[PDB]
Every structure is written in structure tokens, then in C-alpha cells.
Amino acid sequence: FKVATPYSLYVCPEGQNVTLTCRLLGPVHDVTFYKTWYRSSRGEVQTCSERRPIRQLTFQDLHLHHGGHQAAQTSHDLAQRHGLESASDHHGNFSITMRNLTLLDSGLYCCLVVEIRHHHSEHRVHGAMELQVQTGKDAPSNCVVYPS
Ligand SMILES: *[C@@H]1O[C@H](CO)[C@@H](O)[C@H](O)[C@H]1NC(C)=O
Numbered sequence: 001f002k003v004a005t006p007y008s009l010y011v012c013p014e015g016q017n018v019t020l021t022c023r024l025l026g027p028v029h030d031v032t033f034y035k036t037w038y039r040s041s042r043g044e045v046q047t048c049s050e051r052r053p054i055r056q057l058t059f060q061d062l063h064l065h066h067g068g069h070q071a072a073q074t075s076h077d078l079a080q081r082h083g084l085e086s087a088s089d090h091h092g093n094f095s096i097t098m099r100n101l102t103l104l105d106s107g108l109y110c111c112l113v114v115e116i117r118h119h120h121s122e123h124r125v126h127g128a129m130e131l132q133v134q135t136g137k138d139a140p141s142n143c144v145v146y147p148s
């Protein structure tokens with residue numbers, strides 16, 4: 001399968017909430033998925049290579065692990081504590097919702113999905129999208145999204 005990123009740029013004012021989304025396209029019991037988010041950069045040959053924190057949480061803090069037949073969400077704790085919630089549904093939607101945006105939330109966000117069967121990594125795929133948090137006069141009233 002491949003990861004699709006419906007929007008490649010999100011432009012949001014400070015204080016808003018935003019949901020970033022990846023979708024799993026293509027052919028997807030006793031299979032498990034590892035899904036997580038991190039910030040990164042568009043390197044020369046490599047995108048989504050290095051893993052940087054999101055709100056001082058790391059990709060290990062944010063990850064979900066679930067069998068093929070289940071959905072999963074991150075804890076209530078990390079949502080109350082950091083205004084983040086990551087969720088995977090049954091239909092290949094994988095998202096992270098960020099509450100109370102600030103300027104320091106800007107960056108390049110990567111979603112990573114690893115498909116595992118009998119402890120062997122069969123697929124590892126990522127998607128990337130930019131988040132720009134804006135302040136002041138030209139910032140929009142709510143988020144503006146640009147399709148990829
Ligand atoms: C953001 O989401 C929270 C729920 O966590 C809600 O209380 C708040 O009103 C939302 N903010 C905006 C600007 O919609």
C-alpha cells in the first residue's frame with residue numbers, strides 16, 4: 001500500500017485546532033500496524049528521515065500499535081496534557097489533532113505506517129505535509145488547506 005496525503009499545506013492562525021490526515025491507499029488477523037507522527041524536514045535525497053518532537057513529545061510517545069481488525073486512539077492523558085490526539089480508524093484514515101495552536105507548532109509533519117506480520121516488516125511508508133501557524137494581521141480566520 002501507499003500513503004496518500006490529501007493536503008500538503010495547512011495554514012492556521014494561532015489558537016485554532018487542526019487535524020492533519022494521512023490515508024492508506026491500495027491493498028491493506030495476525031497482522032499489526034505501527035503508526036506514529038513526528039516533525040522532520042525535506043532533505044536533499046531524504047524526506048521524513050530524521051524524527052523531531054511534536055510539542056516536546058517524540059514519535060515513541062505518540063505511536064499507536066494495533067491489529068488489522070482494530071481502530072486505536074492515543075490516551076486521554078496525552079490529550080489533556082499536551083493537546084494532541086492521534087487516531088486510526090478501520091478504513092485507512094490516520095490523523096493527529098492538535099489543540100490550541102501556537103507559532104512553535106509550525107513545521108513539516110510526517111505520518112509513518114509500518115505493517116508487521118510475524119515480527120517481519122513488510123511495508124514501511126510515510127507521508128509529509130507542512131503546517132504553518134500564522135500570527136497577526138494576515139493570518140486567516142481559521143485553517144486554510146491546500147491539496148497536494
Ligand atoms: C478546540 O478543541 C477544544 C476541545 O479539546 C474545544 O474546547 C475548543 O473550543 C476548540 N477551539 C476552537 C477554536 O474551535
Ligand SMILES: *[C@@H]1O[C@H](CO)[C@@H](O)[C@H](O)[C@H]1NC(C)=O
Pocket residue numbers: 079080081082083099100
Ligand atoms: C486550550 O485553551 C483553552 C482556552 O481557550 C483552555 O480552556 C483549554 O483547556 C486548552 N486546552 C489544552 C489542551 O491546553
